[model samples]
Target chain A: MQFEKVTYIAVPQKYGQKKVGVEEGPKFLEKLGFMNVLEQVAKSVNKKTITEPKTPQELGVTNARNLNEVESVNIELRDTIAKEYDVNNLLINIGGDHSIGLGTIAGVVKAMKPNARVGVVWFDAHPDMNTPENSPSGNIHGMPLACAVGLGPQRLTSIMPHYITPKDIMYVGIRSIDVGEQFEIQDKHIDHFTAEDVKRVGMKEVIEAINKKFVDYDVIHLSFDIDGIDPEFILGTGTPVPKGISLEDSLYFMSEMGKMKKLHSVDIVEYNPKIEEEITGKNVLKCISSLFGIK
Target chain B: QSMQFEKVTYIAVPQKYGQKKVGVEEGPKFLEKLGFMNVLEQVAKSVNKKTITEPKTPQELGVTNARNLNEVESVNIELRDTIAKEYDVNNLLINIGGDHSIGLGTIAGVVKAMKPNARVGVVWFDAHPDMNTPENSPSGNIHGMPLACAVGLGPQRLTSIMPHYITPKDIMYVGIRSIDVGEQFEIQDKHIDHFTAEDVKRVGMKEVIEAINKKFVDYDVIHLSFDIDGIDPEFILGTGTPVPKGISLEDSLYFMSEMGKMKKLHSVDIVEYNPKIEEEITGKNVLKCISSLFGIK
Candidate 1:
């Protein structure tokens, strides 16, 4: 359905991963004319910023590196999105990192009608399904999907009022999955398309398969990590994954998703501007502008 | 030899007739709120202020291609007179804009005041070359045609504002990326000195400035017309037209600070800041560039 209004939430979060510059993502995109493009798509665009930790040291560290900061920020994000989500409005959460996915999923679930089956279209190079026990780096960003499915630490899983079933999740452009993520995908029978699978089957067939699989869902949320696009195209992301989706294919994917009637919310994450700023920032805007059908 | 200003004259022009946008006219007032005068006071012995009169009513798009011709002519005429009256070599003239359209008046006034004794060079920093004539302009906005007017190629009403037109050799363009077909032809045909946004990235701002210095070595005075859009939208968010992949903030700050040190530099126009777009974030950044231009920390 075409949205009447757009709610843009900027999350300048950095604690989800071990990166210094990811927190500047939201501000970077805004400066690159994110709001200006949004204004062209909807009748009215409302902006909100999720509260960030005053400092990394203030949250203290845990085994999951900055877990407390991640938890606090996501909690605020959860509350914000839960209050703002509407079926007729497009809610976009521009991220600091991928860990905010937990907050976004929980918030949308909390706001949805009782018994509403919510589907998640996760576009990322990594599946982000590794639990703390199986994660190699112990970064919260790697465990958000696990937390969303009630398989990770209770501190994060407990945020969700109801957990999504593995069948309700679709992983697209995944190529850098951890061993645990591969096991979870196989054991839980989660729907997925690797980078090779997209190149082999084409975006048209992949999107068709997605439409067929999630036809029963009441609403769908798109969580897009910038690394899902090839590292050659998007160098600003903290984690650069090679041989991923092409920039052309990615824009086509977002534009097609923009046409989906059941699509309700979106998350754009993991753009770290300190590494390489201009080209990547402009490409990120292109992806966003395409998603909103702004041309 | 480095030049020192005895005082600074801050001219506020609440002009919106240059473009279609409504809030750019509020640029000067917003800068004021951000301590513009306070910053100027630190750079010179004292700061003098003047505001150009604005139109009483909303102007209509009078000419088919020149839009708001009457009001644009009227406001710029008064601005030209005021600037001419206030111009001084010992006093830095800082014209805070309503839009880039007031550039015509500022350049005219500076050239007029310099008279037959001095040659005035113009350094135009913008993402787009504001050189489209009334016949070739797509938007019919006076802001887009200001440089054309200054070079005596635009509407007679605007070209008549200056006593003597500055030739193409007297102008230098920096950070230009989006160019109209006509503007491109003018630059190519006239051999106008320019460094595009891509060129700035290739050869550092240091080299660009050195080239500008060499280009205007013979000139006695230089006027810098800085359109905030010349800097990337990544730094200046509150503008009417935001172009991507423009000059970086660090480079722009360095460029401004370097311009501040030039002995020939006498006047500057900071224009096209729309506070109603993103509010204080852009204004604060714009102020930083201005402060850098005045050698303020």
Candidate 2:
């Protein structure tokens, strides 16, 4: 996704996680020179951040935590991604949490259409396939992958007018899938690579497989969760599962992603700063640095 | 049940002028990623951040008894300018330190922001009193002399950083146990109010804060400088200076929370939280301590 300029859409809203601190992701990344690196790799880069609105105390209904808050934020995200954010500028969304995925994917789908050919590559430890009904924690972050395929509550699924189907969305680095989410993924036949798969086939071939799998698609969205990286490197997120990809693997993956011509906007999500000081934040920054080949 | 405050800006000065273990600059990035600025916004009207760079140490700037004299002044100059610009408009100016030498700038900036006649009360939290001058300091460490500079006892380059000088009595030193021989004499001679770790063992955090609040009653703004070394090394192991039998983590939080209650609190400095020397948890712990100081649980 080589581009002449880049526009960073900072989502400083996070209620999708069970805890706080994810909302700081945008500014924190900005302070880390995320935009500067973007400017260096591309011709120029600019940042426009969204201020989070006041959210209610509890999830209203639909078994989804902060349904209104999450949905509203994603609607803004989708609209921003679909209309305000320039697709040609190599749109990069630094997240508050992964719930914004509902907007990111939907907005991408809205912005581009080749008869349902838009592909999604989600690098995460969790499948994020849980519907609100099946989500044990009730966090919208756990269900964005499901919502992308129009599997969750309408308020969330409707955030974006257009939705990508399950076949086009691929899951990587999955090692902590909930039973319900596993069932949902199996029932939908969603293509995924587990930690074991990465361990066996190696990260290099996994990248090759993903590129080949999504070769037919005209547009590809890369949604990367910091938790997809092994906790050995960092432990700063709300949810951290073991046996994930190495720091080198993640860097290599992003580097490869940068080379793809069909690559669209990227999402770096589920980074909670409340848990650890700055290790995970720096790690995620480093990963993004390598992803854009600024390192 | 909370303090309704205005803007909060975090100025990150990441240079270690006194001693270089090569981990000081890491403090600012660590705390930011851990979301300290975000938490500050909940209590304050707005939150913002700025980072400063350090100049290399010059052998020429080094005095007969002080090391890295030029580099220290360069870092402090940057800090003083940045903090001075925002000190008045900002309700709380939080300066994240690379080392205690940052005080030379931060304290000066706050003093410069105050009116000519208005007094700026200082509440210094550290294991060492840091009142040693180059004339008497056995080690030529600038970190050990910031308190001296604030009190108009160090090199003019630093002591003259701000036109107004803080009164010796206006400064209250807490959580102190380890002090150089020269520092002990300076503290006694200057009649500086201080509560030792032994004193804290007897009076508790409540009375200590009350004592400080009472001392600074005449002042409208309080400048709090907290060195990570003030906490027991067992709890905070990442600082350049580690003192055993220092204050506990819980007590430090309580002390800071009490300071949050002070209407006079204008700015705060958290120094020597080096991430390269310690685990991730230590940095988070320091962030939590700062959060508690700002009224976050």
Candidate 3:
């Protein structure tokens, strides 16, 4: 019933960083028959690949690297996904990198229930809250979360204005965070957990706590970065942390997350099949399929 | 719908990226020397002011037919922040310009100062469209492109000056005569509302001002980006890029007064006043024009 109809918006962008493997992520999934699995779970499945029309080199904004390019991609991606979203349809974006969050999550939230209280459930190894000034690494991929909350550069934070506040955000499986980013998260009072927190409380208790916050919101947007899983589970992402959730827990987490009636859409980002072994691609396929309760 | 501007901040950005000029950067000092602050204190409950110092151009960042872009961006960010602080506290701004390039920052500041959904209107009184892009520009002047950026074109770096996009339909240009081929296309493509000096002469300032108010009636706030070149060189010679057969000083004063009466008026910019090139009388005329724009006259 949750997978009545599905829309797969594929964005092949690595503007999240200078990593080449990230850009090949969507193409790799397409080759691995990820679409075939998607078709089986839904009544009708429509697919569209959004092209990066403007490059950062062409658009030209400094301080934040590839800002112009990132903005262009997000703007196009938002419009495309908004067009693709509707009632009874589940939208899953196959990402190029974490930078895809700028557009993917915003598009789903805008199209699904713009007036509803929207909550973002982000699973990553890092907080992604560094402003241009705060980030020693100026890669905008590292800054989308801050931008989403309207905290960073004007080009990014203002891409599209929305009603979601910091209190509505919940992060899980975060293992690495910069000092400035930690300050930002604490200052905003975001609901989040580290890998140790998951080990301490168990996945079920952690999710239950996150769900408690989700109960207050009308709809939920889930952004799952591949690096949330331990490196033993997958080593494809450019940024990886040591102590992450096991692949088994990650899949189980997705199955449980699917039960939420408030789940609007999901963005699966930073999966670099180029770096991952063939089994790693199959693992990603399993995770995505699990979101729809498919075997 | 109205500005909560009981206090005023006079921000001076005295860097010229439109072209090389010796005296345009001295605009704020000249106006100050003429007792502009004393006049500012006369109207507002409090008067606060600052003159922005721009970063030197980064040699590593090469030009792309847009001069000193890195420097331009750095200064505008500072300009945006300074203005935003003042705007949050219900204060108005009077930006003193180094060149028309200051419009990029001033307009950005005005829009950024508003709520995310707020709609801002602009009335640009300049001799040129200032709509040329880095690609299509003949002189590679940053000042020539502020209006294009304000209308959300050219580069994303420039278009994203403010967090919110200011619709081109919400902007009106007046006293325009000089325009490059690229600028002409941009103005036509965006369907920007404009009145040439000839249009002003034919229809009169009263009719043109009324038309502007009607066009911008839906906006949350209105900003005026005024360039000294909008007036005839025969009347004022302190500005660098003076075009002949422009509006008279009396008409200029009349136009500013009509706009000042709008309750939605949020910010005003006085740009392109060059002190070294000025005759004493012309300096007084430019100062008087700025003062009247503040409703002092």
Candidate 4:
């Protein structure tokens, strides 16, 4: 039994005018017994904290309001993270989207020991490896991966710790990707292996590749973005792709990886149960839970 | 023999001195009241039509452990194993948490069970980023160390526990704000894989979450750390630190609720809801916290 200490943060959006069910992100998950799942998961639940991002300019992005908000959150996230290290235990981040990943990685990096190594295993269907220049659409979500890799504008590049290198990253379960992102990926040499690679080489082989590729790293970070699964598995996501790995394969991957013994931190993002059939969100939750268990 | 998940785990972690307690542990029953079915139903849906048997209380098993610990293990690991035995399933563990630190154990167990591949990206949502490595951090909350351990970079307790050690190139972060001094240098110095809030600000939520979700679409499995605190307190009045500025409630919901957009959304956590300080009565804060996960219309 692990995760004795668990907290809840709710970014409940009661859209003033945008929409009515926007608050449903938190409400729907809660309705799906998310809170009950918590009661069932940890031995002692902690005083949960409910928080949400600042409302945009109220007029939406005149020229990227959400993107700027991301920066603001990053700055604050880094500052607070700097203040606490050993005292804060366990961080379960409920995302506003993949963009939140920037803040998530920053805080974790600040808290680790000096000279410590790090690795990432991302789960998604698309390559998120796009930058503003390469993006077919100028939306920030398409470029979060680029910013994380220190490839985008200086604003984002300035977010990561100087000591945190970009070469220490890798990706998995990739079936969807844009041409521009593909070009940037090839040029940058990011260790993003895809679904085709996994199926062709086998999950075990992929694990071996991970081991060999990250032999020098000491810490392994796991990032879960629900869109990584095929559209059939998750319908809540805004951009469910047509093809990707199966739920069974997802579980096997987690189970197999669990035995490797190098993992330390894990996170799941983007399980929107409000979009598709009820089964979609349920499927996303089951894949990770089956492999990881509660503790 | 696979173990079934039975019983509920509730540990109400109070905020720091002078802080209020919001009955966060009650989140489950509240959400259940909201409409979500039991774990048995969820597991059955994923693992085929196998008969899931919920194990008796841990006391009956003669196990000596923390109530909270058992609850977390049951839902995160044991429950998954039982489901796995019955049918071919990929787990997307959605942890409605009371804190961000749960990512540490949750990730450890996941990597232990699935044996993670080389690439694992972390998408942390917080008013303040949790990547303050030792020197940079003023408080040693384990929550700040999950990213460290995942990449095999933190304390032995976390890094050593997991069998699959990841590397520098395999990590990433999003939706960040507030961090330590050294983190700035640390993030840039080593290949600590990540992104920042500014990137999103310059771009847009649509592009960021979409790409972050699609970054590793091919992983055998995925795990998400859904920290509700990533949103600014203006949107969530019940938060521990009510930061007036940050991501919008609608925007955040739009991004998270877009699971249909990414389709690969697997595993998440809605954490850090301290409802005691809310102006609303009747645990409205906690209930609202639960409601935001669906941030959809």
Badly placed stretches (over 4 Å) of model 2 are A1-67, A75-93, A96-287, A291-293, B1-7, B29-46, B56-64, B88-90, B275-277, B280-285
The DockQ values of the predictions, listed in order, are 0.01, 0.07, 0.01, 0.09
Q: For candidate 4 chain B, which ten residues in a row score worst on lDDT?
A: B44-53
Residue A234 CA displacement from its true place in model 3, Å:
0.8
lDDT of 1 by residue, B1-297 (tens): 133466677787889998888899888777765666446645653345566767767766555788888878888888888788889887788899889999999998897787666688999999989999989998889899999999899889999998888889888999999999999999999999999999999999999999989988999899999999999997899999999999999999999999988878878999999999867789989999998998875
The 10-residue segment with the lowest total lDDT in model 3 chain B: B54-63
Candidate No. with top lDDT: 1
In model 4, state the lDDT of residue B212. Answer: 66
lDDT of 2 by residue, A115-221 (tens): 75888999999888888777787888888978877888888877657667878978889999898877877888888888888888888888888889888888889
TM-score for chain A as predicted in candidate 4: 0.80
Per lDDT, what order, best first?
1, 2, 3, 4
Q: How well does chain B match by TM-score in each candidate? A: 0.96, 0.93, 0.92, 0.66
Residue by residue across B165-216, what tens digits does model 4's lDDT show? 6554444555666666755665677755454556666777777666666666
Q: What does the lDDT read for residue A254 in candidate 4? A: 69
- Candidate 2 interface RMSD, angstroms, 1 decimal: 6.9
Q: Give the per-residue lDDT of model 3 (tens digit) for A159-212.
A: 655736788788889988998878977887888888888888888987798788
Every candidate's lDDT: 0.86, 0.79, 0.77, 0.52
**Worst lDDT window (10 residues) for model 1 chain A?**
A54-63
The lowest-lDDT stretch of 10 consecutive residues in candidate 2 chain A is A39-48
